[PDB]
C-alpha cells in the first residue's frame, strides 16, 4: 500500500553530467544500482516519486517531482531508460524502477517536465550478465533443458528492508533580496524567512512579513527559508540538519528475491 508516502516530499541533487558535458543541479538523480539477480535484472533508485499525486491520492498514470519551493505533477509517459540500446521497463513503485537491457558502459535516465522541457543524468556502469551452463547463447530456445536460477518478484508487499526519513535543512535563495536607493528589501512571499546582515546595527531576526533595512548594500546579507512541514530521505548529497538527527519514520523496499528455473 502507498499509505507510507503521505508525509514525504521529493528533493534536488547534484548530477555529474547534465547532457552537454557539464554538471548541473537536477530534479532527477541516481542512487546506487543493484545487480544481484543471476538473470541479469537491475533495480534503480531515483529521487522522484512515481504513482502519487500532490493530493496524496493513488493514480498509476501520474508522477510528482520537485520544482522551486513546491511539488508539481507530470505525465508518466515520458519516463525512459537506456544503456546504449533502449531498456525495457518492467515495473515501478515510488523511488524504484526495474528494467532489462543489453550490455554497455553507461546508464542514462530522464523524463519530460510539465513545460515541455527534458532532463537527463548519466553515470558510468559496467554491465555483463553471468553465464549459466556450458554453452553461451543469445536468446531463448524452443527445445532445451532447465537449470536453476534466481529472479526478482513483482510484489509490493512489506519486507524486512527499510530506509529512514528525517527533517529537511533550511534552503538559501538569493532572489529574495533586492537593492533600491541604498536600501535592501526582503520579500517573504508567504514563507518564514531568516536573515543575517553584516551592516551597522548587527540586524538579526526571523520574519513573516516584508522588511526594509536602511543604509545597507546587497551581498552584505544572507537569507534562507527555515520552516518545513514534511519529511525527506537523508541522502548523502544533502547536509545534516543538526549534529544529532531525529527520526520521523521509515519506508520499506519492495521486490524480494526468489528461486526460479532457466
Amino acid at each position: 500500500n502507498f499509505n507510507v508516502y503521505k508525509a514525504t516530499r521529493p528533493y534536488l541533487a547534484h548530477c555529474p553530467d547534465c547532457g552537454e558535458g557539464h554538471s548541473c543541479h537536477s530534479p532527477i538523480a541516481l542512487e546506487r544500482i543493484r545487480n544481484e539477480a543471476t538473470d541479469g535484472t537491475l533495480k534503480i533508485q531515483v529521487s522522484l516519486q512515481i504513482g502519487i499525486k500532490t493530493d496524496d491520492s493513488h493514480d498509476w498514470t501520474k508522477l510528482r517531482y520537485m520544482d522551486s519551493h513546491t511539488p508539481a505533477d507530470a505525465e508518466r509517459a515520458g519516463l525512459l531508460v537506456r544503456t546504449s540500446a533502449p531498456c525495457t521497463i518492467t515495473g515501478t513503485m515510488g523511488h524504484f524502477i526495474l528494467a532489462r537491457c543489453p550490455k554497455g558502459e553507461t546508464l542514462t535516465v530522464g523524463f519530460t517536465d510539465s513545460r515541455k522541457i527534458s532532463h537527463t543524468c548519466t553515470h558510468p556502469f559496467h554491465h555483463e550478465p553471468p553465464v549459466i551452463g556450458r554453452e553461451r547463447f543469445h536468446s531463448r530456445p524452443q527445445h532445451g533443458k532447465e537449470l536453476p536460477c534466481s529472479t526478482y518478484v513483482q510484489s509490493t508487499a512489506a519486507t524486512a528492508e527499510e530506509i529512514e526519513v528525517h527533517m529537511p535543512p533550511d534552503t538559501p535563495d538569493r532572489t529574495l533580496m533586492t537593492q533600491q536607493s541604498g536600501n535592501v528589501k526582503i520579500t517573504v512571499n508567504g514563507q518564514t524567512v531568516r536573515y543575517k546582515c553584516n551592516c551597522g546595527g548587527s540586524n538579526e531576526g526571523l520574519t513573516t512579513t516584508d522588511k526594509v533595512i536602511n543604509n545597507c548594500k546587497i551581498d552584505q546579507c544572507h537569507a534562507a527559508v527555515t520552516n518545513h512541514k514534511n519529511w525527506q530521505y537523508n541522502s548523502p548529497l544533502v547536509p545534516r540538519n543538526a549534529e544529532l538527527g531525529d527520526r520521523k519514520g521509515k519506508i520499506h523496499i519492495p521486490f524480494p528475491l526468489a528461486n526460479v528455473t532457466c
Epitope: 536600501n183 520579500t187 517573504v188 512571499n189 508567504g190 513573516t208 512579513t209 516584508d210 526594509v212
Partner: antibody
Framework: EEQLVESGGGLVQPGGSLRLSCAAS????????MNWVRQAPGKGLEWVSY????????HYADSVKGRFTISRDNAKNSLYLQMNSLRAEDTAVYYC?????????????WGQGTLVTVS | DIQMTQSPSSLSASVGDRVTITCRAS??????LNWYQQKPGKAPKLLIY???SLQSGVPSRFSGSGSGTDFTLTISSLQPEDFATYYC?????????FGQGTKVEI
C-alpha cells in the same frame, strides 16, 4: 498632494453585506502596502487587516476571520474592504491607511473613515 | 501577542508646564515603536516614527527615546494647541497593537 478618501458607509440590516472603498491620489499606488483599522465611540485603536504591495501576503485579525476579505487593484488605484454576514455588534467607523516605504515600519498617512451601522 | 500599557492615564497641567508620557510592553520591541497624537473629532494622528528620530513637520518641542520595553516621550513646552490624546504602537510582530491612550487637560 496625498489623499485618502473613504466612502461606502451607511446602515445595513443584520445578515446583509457592505463594501467599503478607499481612494488614493498623490503617490504611486503599487509601491506601498496598506492596512485597515477600526475605531468607534468609547473604543481605542484596533488593527483589522493587512495586504502586501503585490497581493502575495495577507493577514486577518482573529476576531474578523471569515466575514472579512481584502483586495486591491494596482491599475485602478483603488483599495477595497468587503464585510459579509454583518452582525449587530459591528457598528464603527472604518479607516484606510498607508504604510511607509522605509525602515522601522512607519505609518505616514491616515484617511477619514465612514460610519457603518448594522441594525 | 505583545501587550502594551502606558502611564499616566491622564495628565493635568497648566500652560508652560512640561509633559512626560511613558509606554511599557510585555515583550521586547527592539525600538520598533512610534507615537501618535490627535485631537477629538479627527482621524489623522502622527508623532515621531522612531526612537530618537524627529518626524518631518513636527515642532522641535517634541522629542523622545526608546529602550527595552520602556519608551518615553516628552514635550518641552505645553501650549493650548498641544492638548490632545496620545498613543503608542509597536510594529515588531503580527498583529500590530496599540496602547490604551493618554489624555492631557489644562
Amino acid at each position: 498632494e496625498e489623499q485618502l478618501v473613504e466612502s461606502g458607509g451607511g446602515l445595513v440590516q443584520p445578515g446583509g453585506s457592505l463594501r467599503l472603498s478607499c481612494a488614493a491620489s498623490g503617490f504611486t499606488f503599487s509601491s506601498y502596502s496598506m492596512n485597515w483599522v477600526r475605531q468607534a465611540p468609547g473604543k481605542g485603536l484596533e488593527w483589522v487587516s493587512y495586504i502586501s504591495s503585490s497581493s502575495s501576503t495577507i493577514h486577518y485579525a482573529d476576531s474578523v476571520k471569515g466575514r472579512f476579505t481584502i483586495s486591491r487593484d494596482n491599475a485602478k488605484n483603488s483599495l477595497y474592504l468587503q464585510m459579509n454576514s454583518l452582525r449587530a455588534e459591528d457598528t464603527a467607523v472604518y479607516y484606510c491607511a498607508r504604510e511607509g516605504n522605509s525602515g522601522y515600519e512607519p505609518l505616514d498617512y491616515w484617511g477619514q473613515g465612514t460610519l457603518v451601522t448594522v441594525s | 501577542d505583545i501587550q502594551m500599557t502606558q502611564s499616566p492615564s491622564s495628565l493635568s497641567a497648566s500652560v508652560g508646564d512640561r509633559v512626560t508620557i511613558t509606554c511599557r510592553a510585555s515583550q521586547s520591541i527592539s525600538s520598533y515603536l512610534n507615537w501618535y497624537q490627535q485631537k477629538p473629532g479627527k482621524a489623522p494622528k502622527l508623532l515621531i516614527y522612531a526612537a530618537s528620530s524627529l518626524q518631518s513637520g513636527v515642532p522641535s518641542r517634541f522629542s523622545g527615546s526608546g529602550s527595552g520595553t520602556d519608551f518615553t516621550l516628552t514635550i518641552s513646552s505645553l501650549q493650548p494647541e498641544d492638548f490632545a490624546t496620545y498613543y503608542c504602537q509597536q510594529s515588531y510582530s503580527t498583529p500590530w497593537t496599540f496602547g490604551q491612550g493618554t489624555k492631557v487637560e489644562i
